Design a protein around this ligand. Structure first.
Ligand SMILES: CNS(=O)(=O)Nc1nccc(Cc2c(C)c3ccc(Oc4ncccc4F)cc3oc2=O)c1F
Ligand SMILES: CNS(=O)(=O)Nc1nccc(Cc2c(C)c3ccc(Oc4ncccc4F)cc3oc2=O)c1F
Ligand SMILES: Nc1ncnc2c1ncn2[C@@H]1O[C@H](COP(=O)(O)OP(=O)(O)NP(=O)(O)O)[C@@H](O)[C@H]1O
Ligand SMILES: Nc1ncnc2c1ncn2[C@@H]1O[C@H](COP(=O)(O)OP(=O)(O)NP(=O)(O)O)[C@@H](O)[C@H]1O
Ligand SMILES: Nc1ncnc2c1ncn2[C@@H]1O[C@H](COP(=O)(O)OP(=O)(O)NP(=O)(O)O)[C@@H](O)[C@H]1O
Ligand SMILES: [Mg+2]
Ligand SMILES: [Mg+2]
Lengths: 261, 299, 272, 300
């Protein structure tokens, strides 16, 4: 139904993701491997199946897939930059009202995903696009799974909950580990920095965060940050996943906070 | 200081490298053409041809999302490699940026990395690892004495060899900004990090010695010594468990004691560069006569 | 699937009316628009229109098509879409009289054409394209909405047609007015409606604003005696846009261009 | 010219209207549905501040607030439209995207509804209807220089007292403009000159009356299942309908013929119709329309 015929998609400049043309501008994420492995087709089928379950303004709009020539997923083309680019490359000076709205919209999309029983498993500022400098789009569903009734470490360590790093529980990934990743996004928004900026050893970060010896320095939170936001951020970042709130409650906390400004 | 001295052939090889290097000027993407793919890591490395000079070179691309100011400072700090000239340190040609990737151009090693030789041998003979131990110790001593830096990433994939018999170190921490920038990504599946660095305590070049010891144990037994586990389990094992040891039967007592003194978890009791150079395992293998080239070519 | 259990949707302020049902602002994982059939005894046509709109919307995933998000069967039939804060193009052009610059007027036409091209590539004929059904959002992102009347491979509500419903007269091609062909609808009749939208954009006015007789418009437009007054187009409108508008408004449907060609013409004049 | 009873009823109605002030949505309570047109259901309601039972019509429009305000002001002319042949006006207001027009409730409904129960309407009854419409149009022309613009059986209302009153005429110029782009019907009574975009006048309301009279006389819509355009094309192209023979007097047949002449210049005008033999005979006839109506539709 969403398969796009071969000669329709025009591939353009490389941004992996290319800027392309299919009924207007689109982003085309392709697998340049000529021989896809089972794990490659598995990941491709898993991602398309997850994306086709999503219809929400804060989720990157899936539009179709192509199996010929190369395996490609087609989404809307987002205008602007990622939240990681804004906070850490060009240092965009967002007002606190916009920082809260970015947090609100991100929580809005995650709450939608969790209502669809989707664990994103790769939430990070690089995968949050600020479309038209206005609308949060959560992208990159390459690791997303549908939680059902029935392995090596994979992802970016800065947004990984300690139980995800440890990979020792029967299900290291949960809704609550998505919440932890969101908590790091809140840290990025309210400090303008990545966590552990004084630690330049990746394996040290892995060991110490997984052991609960290292956690984000919440004193870097700017003074204009509301008290309810630093408190919500600390609750999302709890080392024990059962102490983290879920996104329905995170949303209500942000909304009340937003009215109290 | 005696380890820093070169024989006649090593002095001739170094000057011949610096002479061919003198023909190279400002590096640009337009001046390069790919030859083959030398391998890949957590980063891709291509064997390339610099057209203006005709030299064969190795080009590593590091994909980073960093401020342009940080990118330019990295290029500036990588220039220190122009003064890192040694028969045990990989030569450097230039570094530049294009298409969101930072290029690092260096000397090509046809033999490859010692981690790829392990797959083409299973285990590495003791007298071969004796030459490797000498090359690593001398290379670590050169960096500390001439540039006041450690390698901080010693492992079989960062010890490169060639058909000319040379064994050189590569990918060491010459740029403070590049170290910081690469800390948040490049997740590996195994680790050679010292226990004290993993725990965030004070460290020095002793950590490179610990990493060398683990690399030698791997290349001797043909298997990664830590502990299949994920990375955190491996790191936890390094911190909590006693270090690995070499089998008692085949390996000589001196080689076992050499590795054991490298792998002491307390860095204050771990042997240092001076003690290791005057160790019984080094002197026996130093005066020994091994054709590492022939063994490398066959393996 | 896309069915929303009752209780999760919070219905808020009334926003307007659709072709079938009433549209409200609502809350469901954020702001949503909820179009409800607030009728105690709904007619077969209203029931089939709800079924049709859900079926057509489920086939659409494009930035210029209003984002379908879900539907509810109880306590009432309702269609949930994204909420568009900028209301409709009709509201902007003819209610508050927003003064869009020509570059933005052209881009609105371009995004509308973009969404229509997507629809026709999936054999979806809208049959009720008008400025009321073009919603704005963000920095004037166009969203084509209201698919109650839309056909897919000439089928309606999951079945072949046993009647030919019709929408608003002003955007209605002459052959749809006359209702003399067995099937008077086509890609080209959608193009005509787009032409009327182009007329709204470039004149700021609805067509036939001087004729206040509904039956007069039906007869004379259907007879080809009445057509939009292209002299009302503003002087800042590019000549290539007036030529394209004139081709989209041709009385004979075979002479109208299709949307792939329409897009190429808008992208060419937008570059100038 | 008004009779004594006609002068009394109007005074009693104007006194009833003195009990009515500014209209607001909360001051109304629904009772029942009076019927449905292309604009929706008209409701019989109760105005609690005055107690009077009214008919409430809701006209859904998307228009400027300024145009909405001018429509309400233009509708105030209806307060000066006082005639036994004109449905009374109580007020109008805006509420939730629709303009509510409240008017006199006619407990006999529209002649469109009466025709459904009656099948056909006898000639002498239609003579009283003809007088009511001709006197209404003449009143609108001479007193307010306005046409009706929408004469048809559904816009001629009747009551248990035997009164026949015109409704839904073009009093608000902006409401006419605002309603031109929607509210499409399935039939039409529009004159051929107005369909074709040529000059028109109250002559057009005479055409629409003549067409309505034929419909009520023979019990069938006389134009031409054709969709709306084909009916409009038929009105323009074909000659007008005529009454059948052997049923109606020659005076009635001649009356509707002169109403249906497609050339408005030769079509009879209000003055000529007012002295037509059919109207002269009908005016002097004693017709119990009140009793006929209640017995026909079942009123008490
Ligand atoms: C895992 N341990 S750690 O956590 O300490 N991370 C790090 N370790 C060590 C270093 C760095 C950064 C870095 C890297 C990776 C690097 C790579 C190549 C390079 O080119 C040449 N190299 C040697 C000889 C000739 C050359 F041309 C210079 C480099 O310089 C650098 O500084 C780290 F991030
Ligand atoms: C088909 N011919 S057309 O094309 O000319 N269209 C039109 N024809 C005629 C009129 C109009 C507009 C209009 C309407 C519809 C209207 C309705 C009710 C009303 O209340 C009362 N009316 C009379 C007595 C008492 C009342 F309470 C006032 C109204 O005032 C109006 O002006 C048209 F749009
Ligand atoms: N839908 C999209 N619209 C616009 N830009 C996009 C879109 N998806 C991804 N990008 C950008 O295109 C690039 C591809 O990023 P990504 O999806 O992570 O794949 P990648 O090839 O691994 N690049 P990287 O972000 O370094 O991992 C990044 O610069 C994104 O910001
Ligand atoms: N100068 C060189 N000459 C020849 N081969 C080289 C050279 N540099 C790198 N290589 C090869 O390229 C491979 C990739 O190196 P690299 O990108 O540094 O990853 P790695 O060191 O192997 N493992 P990791 O550091 O965890 O990413 C190495 O394993 C070598 O085999
Ligand atoms: N004052 C009134 N008293 C009683 N019934 C009324 C009154 N006004 C209107 N009605 C009835 O309400 C119904 C709807 O009237 P209306 O909305 O004007 O449409 P219509 O004249 O019947 N047909 P159309 O004009 O084509 O939409 C009709 O059946 C009328 O008889
Ligand atoms: Mg390396
Ligand atoms: Mg009416």
């Amino acid at each position: 139904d969403w398969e796009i015929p071969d000669g329709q998609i025009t591939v353009g400049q490389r941004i992996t993701v290319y800027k392309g043309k299919w009924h207007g501008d689109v982003a085309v994420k392709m697998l340049n491997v000529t021989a896809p492995t089972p794990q490659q087709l598995q990941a491709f089928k898993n991602e398309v199946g997850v994306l086709r379950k999503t219809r929400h303004v804060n989720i990157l709009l899936f539009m179709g897939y192509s199996t010929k020539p190369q395996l490609a997923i087609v989404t809307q083309w987002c205008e602007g930059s990622s939240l990681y680019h804004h906070l850490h490359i060009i240092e965009t000076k967002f007002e606190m009202i916009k920082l809260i709205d970015i947090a609100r919209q991100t929580a809005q999309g995650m709450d939608y995903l969790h209502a669809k029983s989707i664990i994103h498993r790769d939430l990070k500022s690089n995968n949050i696009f600020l479309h038209e400098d206005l609308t949060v789009k959560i992208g990159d569903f390459g690791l997303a799974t549908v939680k059902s009734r029935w392995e090596q470490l994979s992802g970016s360590i800065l947004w990984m909950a300690p139980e995800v790093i440890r990979m020792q529980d029967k299900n290291p990934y949960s809704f609550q580990s998505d919440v932890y990743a969101f908590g790091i996004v809140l840290y990025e928004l309210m400090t303008g920095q990545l966590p552990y900026s004084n630690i330049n050893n990746r394996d040290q970060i892995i060991f110490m965060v997984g052991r609960g010896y290292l956690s984000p320095d919440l004193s870097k939170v700017r003074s204009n940050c509301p008290k309810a936001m630093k408190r919500l951020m600390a609750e999302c970042l709890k080392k024990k996943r059962d102490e983290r709130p879920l996104f329905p409650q995170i949303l209500a906390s942000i909304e009340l906070l937003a009215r109290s400004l | 200081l005696e380890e820093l001295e070169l024989d006649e052939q090593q002095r001739k090889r170094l000057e011949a490298f610096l002479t061919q290097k003198q023909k190279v000027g400002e590096l640009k993407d337009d001046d390069f053409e790919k030859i083959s793919e030398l391998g890949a890591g957590n980063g891709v490395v291509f064997k390339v041809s610099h057209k203006p000079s005709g030299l064969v070179m190795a080009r590593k691309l590091i994909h980073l999302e960093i401020k342009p100011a940080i990118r330019n400072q990295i290029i500036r700090e990588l220039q220190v490699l122009h003064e890192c000239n040694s028969p045990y340190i990989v030569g450097f040609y230039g570094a530049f940026y294009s298409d969101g990737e930072i290029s690092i151009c260096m000397e090509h090693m046809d033999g490859g990395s010692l981690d790829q030789v392990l797959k083409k041998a299973g285990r590495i003979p003791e007298q071969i690892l004796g030459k490797v131990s000498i090359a690593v110790i001398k290379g670590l001593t050169y960096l500390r004495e001439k540039h006041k830096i450690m390698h901080r990433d010693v492992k079989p994939s960062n010890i490169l060899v060639n058909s000319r018999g040379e064994i050189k170190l590569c990918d060491f921490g010459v740029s403070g900004q590049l170290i910081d920038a690469m800390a948040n990504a490049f997740v590996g599946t195994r680790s050679y990090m010292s226990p004290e660095r993993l725990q965030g305590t004070h460290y020095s070049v002793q950590s490179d010695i610990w990493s060398m010891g683990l690399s030698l144990v791997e290349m001797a037994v043909g298997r990664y010594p830590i502990g299949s586990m994920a990375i955190f389990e491996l790191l936890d094992y390094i911190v909590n468990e006693p270090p690995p040891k070499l089998p008692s039967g085949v390996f000589s007592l001196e080689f076992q004691d050499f590795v054991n003194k490298c792998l002491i978890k307390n860095p204050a009791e771990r042997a240092d560069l001076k003690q290791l150079m005057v160790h019984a395992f080094i002197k026996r293998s130093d005066a020994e006569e091994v054709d590492f080239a022939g063994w490398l070519c066959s393996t």
